[PDB]
Amino acid sequence: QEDVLAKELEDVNKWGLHVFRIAELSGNRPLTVIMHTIFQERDLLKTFKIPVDTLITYLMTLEDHYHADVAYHNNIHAADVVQSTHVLLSTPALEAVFTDLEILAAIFASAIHDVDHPGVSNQFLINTNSELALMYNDSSVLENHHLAVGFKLLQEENCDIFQNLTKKQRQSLRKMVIDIVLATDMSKHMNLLADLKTMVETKKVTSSGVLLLDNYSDRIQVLQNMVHCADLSNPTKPLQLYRQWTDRIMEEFFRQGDRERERGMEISPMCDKHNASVEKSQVGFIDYIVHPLWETWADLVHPDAQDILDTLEDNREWYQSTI
Amino acid sequence: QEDVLAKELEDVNKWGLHVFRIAELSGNRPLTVIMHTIFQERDLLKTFKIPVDTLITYLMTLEDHYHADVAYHNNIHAADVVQSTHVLLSTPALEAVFTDLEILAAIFASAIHDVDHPGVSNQFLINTNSELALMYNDSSVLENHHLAVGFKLLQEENCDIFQNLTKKQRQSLRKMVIDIVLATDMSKHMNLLADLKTMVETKKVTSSGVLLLDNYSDRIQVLQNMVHCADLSNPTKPLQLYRQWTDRIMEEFFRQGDRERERGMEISPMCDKHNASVEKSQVGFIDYIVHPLWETWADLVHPDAQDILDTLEDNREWYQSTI
Numbered sequence: 223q224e225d226v227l228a229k230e231l232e233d234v235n236k237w238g239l240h241v242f243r244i245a246e247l248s249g250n251r252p253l254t255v256i257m258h259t260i261f262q263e264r265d266l267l268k269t270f271k272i273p274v275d276t277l278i279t280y281l282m283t284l285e286d287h288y289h290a291d292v293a294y295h296n297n298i299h300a301a302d303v304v305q306s307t308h309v310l311l312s313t314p315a316l317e318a319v320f321t322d323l324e325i326l327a328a329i330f331a332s333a334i335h336d337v338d339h340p341g342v343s344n345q346f347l348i349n350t351n352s353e354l355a356l357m358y359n360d361s362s363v364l365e366n367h368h369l370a371v372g373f374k375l376l377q378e379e380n381c382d383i384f385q386n387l388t389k390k391q392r393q394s395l396r397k398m399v400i401d402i403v404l405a406t407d408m409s410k411h412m413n414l415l416a417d418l419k420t421m422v423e424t425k426k427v428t429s430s431g432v433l434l435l436d437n438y439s440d441r442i443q444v445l446q447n448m449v450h451c452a453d454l455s456n457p458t459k460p461l462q463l464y465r466q467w468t469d470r471i472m473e474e475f476f477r478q479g480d481r482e483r484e485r486g487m488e489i490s491p492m493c494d495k496h497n498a499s500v501e502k503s504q505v506g507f508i509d510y511i512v513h514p515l516w517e518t519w520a521d522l523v524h525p526d527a528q529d530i531l532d533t534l535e536d537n538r539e540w541y542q543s544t545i
Numbered sequence: 546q547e548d549v550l551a552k553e554l555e556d557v558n559k560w561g562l563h564v565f566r567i568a569e570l571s572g573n574r575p576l577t578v579i580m581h582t583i584f585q586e587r588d589l590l591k592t593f594k595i596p597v598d599t600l601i602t603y604l605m606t607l608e609d610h611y612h613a614d615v616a617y618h619n620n621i622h623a624a625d626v627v628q629s630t631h632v633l634l635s636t637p638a639l640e641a642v643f644t645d646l647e648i649l650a651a652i653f654a655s656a657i658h659d660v661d662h663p664g665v666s667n668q669f670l671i672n673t674n675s676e677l678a679l680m681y682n683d684s685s686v687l688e689n690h691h692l693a694v695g696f697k698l699l700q701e702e703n704c705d706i707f708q709n710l711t712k713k714q715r716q717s718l719r720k721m722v723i724d725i726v727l728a729t730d731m732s733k734h735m736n737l738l739a740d741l742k743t744m745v746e747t748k749k750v751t752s753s754g755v756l757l758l759d760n761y762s763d764r765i766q767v768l769q770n771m772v773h774c775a776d777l778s779n780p781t782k783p784l785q786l787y788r789q790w791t792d793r794i795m796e797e798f799f800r801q802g803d804r805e806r807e808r809g810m811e812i813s814p815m816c817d818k819h820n821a822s823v824e825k826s827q828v829g830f831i832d833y834i835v836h837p838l839w840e841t842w843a844d845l846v847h848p849d850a851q852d853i854l855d856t857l858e859d860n861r862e863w864y865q866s867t868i
C-alpha cells in the first residue's frame with residue numbers, strides 16, 4: 223500500500239532518486255520522509271538520542287514552512303538537496319572523513335537551506351525595500367532568513383531534535399550550519415569556487431584514495447561547496463528529472479519578472495517570459511556556473527564524480543540540441 | 546536655560562564638547578540638539594532639502610529608541626559619537642575629500658550606530674540564545690539590529706529625512722551606512738586596524754596635502770575607521786569626560802556580569818564587580834585597543850590629531866598612576 227513509497231525510498235543513496243514520485247506518494251511530504259529515512263540509514267537517531275516523534279514533529283513543521291505555491295524553492299527542492307548532499311557525503315574519496323556531527327550539520331543545513339522562501343531573489347527583496355532586506359541590511363537576505371526560521375522552529379513544542387547533544391556540540395553544529403547555509407548565497411559562488419580550486423591544486427590523499435583535510439577552515443569549505451553543489455545539482459540528474467526542475471525554476475522566475483514589470487523595475491535576467499530562451503539559459507547556467515563548479519568537485523573526489531559529470535555533459539549536449 | 550544650551554552648542558566643532566551638560570540642558574535630548582546643530586553647521590538641510598520638522602521628528606524618534614536605562618549605550622553615547630565624527634570629518638588632511646553624501650552617511654551612521662542597544666554584548670546575546678542572536682545568526686548581532694532599527698524609523702510618520710535624495714543617492718547612502726555601522730563590531734577591529742595600517746604605510750596625498758582616495762574601498766575604509774575611532778574616543782577626551790564614560794561602561798558591564806553570575810555562566814572580562822579592576826581595564830583598553838587605533842589614525846592625518854593623541858597618552862598615564 224505504502225510499499226510504493228517504501229520501494230522508491232529504497233533508492234535513497236542513489237543519484238537520481240525519484241523525488242517527484244516520492245513527493246506524490248508521501249502525501250506531499252518528501253522532505254519529512256527523505257530526512258527520516260536518511261537519519262535511519264546513517265543511524266543518527268540513536269547516535270544523537272533523537273526521539274523519533276520529535277524528529278517527525280520538527281520535520282513536518284519545517285516542511286510546512288516551505289511554500290507550496292512556490293514552483294521551485296519548495297519542500298521538493300529541499301528534499302532533493304538533502305538527498306543529494308547525503309550521497310556526496312558517502313563518496314569513497316570522503317568516507318569516514320566527517321564526524322557524525324559534521325554529517326548532521328550538512329544534512330540539517332540542506333533541509334533548512336531555503337525554508338520560507340517567498341519565490342523571489344535577494345535582489346528583488348533589496349530593490350523593493352522589503353521587510354526582509356530591511357531586517358538583514360541587504361546582505362544574504364534570504365539565506366539569513368532560512369537559517370533563522372530553521373533554528374527557530376526547533377523551539378516549537380517537541381521539535382528540539384538536538385535536545386540530547388552536549389552544549390558545545392550544539393554550538394559547533396549551529397556554527398557549521400550557519401557557515402554552510404550562508405555559503406548557498408550565489409553572490410559567494412565565485413570566491414567559494416576559487417577556494418575550491420585552490421584546495422584541489424594543493425590537495426593531499428591517502429593510499430586507499432581518501433582525502434586529507436587537517437583544519438576546520440578547509441573542511442567547512444568542502445561541506446560548503448558540497449551543499450552548494452547539491453543546490454546546483456539539477457543539471458547533473460537524469461534528464462527527465464532535470465527537465466522538471468527547469469520547468470519549475472522558470473515558472474518561478476517568470477512569476478517574479480511579472481511583478482518586476484508591474485512595479486516598473488528592470489526585469490531580472492531570465493524572468494521576462496516575453497523574451498527569454500529557457501534552453502539557452504540552461505546552457506549558460508551549465509557553461510558558466512554548474513560545470514565549472516562540478517568539474518572542480520570531480521577533481522577533489524576523483525574518480526568519484528565521473529558518473530555525475532558524465533550525466534551533466536550529456537544533459538548539456540541535449541539542451542544545446544534543442545536550440 | 547535655552548540661552549545656556551545654545552551657548553554650549555557653540556562648541557560643537559571642538560573635541561571635548563561637554564555632552565553631559567548638553568544632555569541636561571536639552572532635557573535629555575543630546576542626540577537631537579547636537580544632530581540638528583551639526584546639520585545646520587554643515588548646511589545639510591539645504592543641500593539635501595531636508596524639512597526641519599522632518600529632521601526633528603526623526604531625531605526625536607531615533608533618540609527615544611535608545612534605552613534611557615542603559616548606563617553607557619544610550620543617547621548620550623550616540624550624540625558623543627556623532628559629534629566626535631563631526632570633528633574628525635573637519636580635519637585639515639581630509640578637506641574636500643568626501644562628498645556631501647559621504648559626510649551625511651558618516652554622521653547618520655554615527656547617530657544610529659547603537660540604537661536599541663539592550664546593555665549586553667554580542668557574546669552574551671549569543672550565549673543566552675536571545676531572539677536577536679537567533680535572528681542574525683550570531684554575526685554582528687547588535688550592529689545588524691542597530692541598522693535595521695535606524696533605517697526602519699525613517700518610515701514612521703514624517704520621519705523620512707532622505708525623502709528628497711535621488712534614488713541613486715539613497716542607494717549609495719544606504720550601502721555606506723551599512724558598511725560603516727557593521728565596522729563598529731569589535732570582532733572586526735583587528736582586520737580594520739590592519740587595513741588602516743597598510744593604508745598609512747602606502748598613503749598618498751594630493752598636491753594640496755590632502756589625503757588622496759581613489760575608490761570606494763579606500764573611501765569607505767577611512768569612514769569606517771573614522772566612526773570606529775569616534776566610537777572608541779572616550780579615552781582621548783578631557784579627563785572629566787573620560788572618567789564619567791568609565792563609570793558608565795563599568796556600571797553597564799557589571800550588570801551584565803550579575804546576569805551572567807546569576808545564570809551560572811562564566812563572567813565576561815571586566816564584568817565581575819567583586820573582582821574587576823576599573824583602572825587596569827582602562828589601561829589595558831588603551832594599550833591594546835584605543836592607542837593602537839588612534840596612533841594609526843593620527844599617522845593617517847598627521848599632524849592634525851597630535852593634541853588628541855597627547856590627551857590619550859596623558860589619560861593613560863593618569864589611570865596608570867592610580868595603580
Ligand SMILES: CCn1c(=O)c2c(c3ccc(C)nc31)O[C@@](C)(C/C=N/O)C[C@H]2C=C(C)C
Pocket residue numbers: 295299336408453454456457467468471472492503504507511
Ligand atoms: C535558469 C537557470 N538557473 C539559475 O539561473 C539559477 C538556479 C537554477 C537552478 C536550477 C535550474 C534548472 N536553473 C537555474 O539556481 C540558483 C537560483 C540557486 C537555487 N537555489 O535554490 C542560482 C540561479 C543562478 C543565478 C542567479 C546565476
Ligand SMILES: CCn1c(=O)c2c(c3ccc(C)nc31)O[C@@](C)(C/C=N/O)C[C@H]2C=C(C)C
Pocket residue numbers: 618622659731776777779780790791794795815826827830834
Ligand atoms: C572598560 C573598557 N572598555 C571596553 O572594554 C570597551 C569599550 C569601552 C568604551 C568606553 C570605555 C571607557 N571603556 C571601554 O567600548 C566597546 C564596548 C565599544 C563601545 N561601543 O559603544 C569596546 C569595549 C571593548 C572590548 C569588548 C575589548
Ligand SMILES: [Mg+2]
Pocket residue numbers: 335336364406407
Ligand atoms: Mg537558496
Ligand SMILES: [Mg+2]
Pocket residue numbers: 658659687729730
Ligand atoms: Mg556598538
Ligand SMILES: [Zn+2]
Pocket residue numbers: 299303335336406453
Ligand atoms: Zn536552494
Ligand SMILES: [Zn+2]
Pocket residue numbers: 622626658659729776
Ligand atoms: Zn558605540
